[PDB]
Amino acid sequence: VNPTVFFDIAVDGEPLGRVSFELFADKVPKTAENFRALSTGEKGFGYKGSCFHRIIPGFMCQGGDFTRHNGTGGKSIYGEKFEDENFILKHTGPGILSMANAGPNTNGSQFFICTAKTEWLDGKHVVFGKVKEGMNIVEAMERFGSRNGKTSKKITIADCGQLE
Amino acid sequence: PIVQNLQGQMVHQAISPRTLNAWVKVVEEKAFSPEVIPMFSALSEGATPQDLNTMLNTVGGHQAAMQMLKETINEEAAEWDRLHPVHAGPIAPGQMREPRGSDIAGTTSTLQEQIGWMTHNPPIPVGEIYKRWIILGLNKIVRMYS
After folding, report:
1. Which residues carry attached sugars according to the database record (chain A)?
2. What kind of fold does domain B1-146 have according to CATH?
């Protein structure tokens, strides 16, 4: 049974709602372990307090750059970056959780949550999970995006950890 | 070059062989004297980085000078990367990756990506930026020719 993580999402400091994710650790164990450990903050760094710095409506919400907060940063629990584990899972629709990267084998901490079917991302980004509960929160985050990704309000991970 | 068509938009046209030849003839007569810098800049309006490299790769001789130039373009490419850190993706449909140094100089970018940057809205003017680099390079190598 797959690990489960949650995020409490907030906008300009005020609660929005909790989103929960199943992580497909059977298919991509190292990539799922990275995201889970970063969500509990058990190695002393991770997602708590960081921002969704790039939201593009009809596309995805991207966060996880906890070092530089604009997409130029981030790190994994394996070091600066780790390899693409496989591309077994594909971008089949809304709620898919996938690794943002700067090219092959440059997975760090940045991730995205798809708000549509993003087929052309197949084989480029590692898919490692899916939204289990709270797709309405991600649909409500979309509102605060823009076509170039800049957000009109600070969308933050107020808190996070492991449910299961 | 990139140009406007009857319907409104900017579209690619191939470099004129007559432009190329004019450039070739300026170098034969003047070498790399100062006066070639304004010539180059006039002859390269709206040029893509691929056009700019065609112009440079037509020059016969002046090998010392051409290496100097390439080394100067290479410094500017590295400095561009130093000042424009890469932003992690995914690329939205209609969008393009952000150009690296190597892309602006035409080494790692195809003509279609160059057209892509130069015709986006807002435009990333990889032609104009590369031309700036080249013109700095020319302003260095013209020392060998007073």
Report:
1. 107
2. Human Immunodeficiency Virus Type 1 Capsid Protein (1.10.375)
Q: How was this structure determined?
A: X-ray
Residue A12 to residue A153: CA distance in whole angstroms = 6
- Supply the range of the domain harboring residue A83: 1-164
Q: Over the range A12-28, which residues count as b (16 or more CB within 10 Å of their CB) and which as e?
A: eeeebbbbbbbbbbebb
Backbone φ/ψ region at B121: left (φ over 0), alpha (ψ -120 to 50), beta: beta
Report the number of distinct structural domains present in chain A. Answer: 1
Number of Cβ within a 10 Å radius of residue B55 = 20
- Selected for mutation to probe chain A from B82, B87, B95, B120 (highest A CB count within 10 Å) is B87
- What is the domain partition of chain B in residue ranges? 1-146
Taking Cα atoms as reference points, which of A135, A80, A133 lies closest to residue A113? A135
Enumerate residues preceding breaks in chain A (C to N > 2.5 Å).
none
Report the greatest alpha carbon distance in chain A: 38
Q: Establish, for the pair of chains A and B, how many residue pairs have beta carbons separated by less than 8 Å.
A: 37
CATH at residue A152: 2.40.100.10
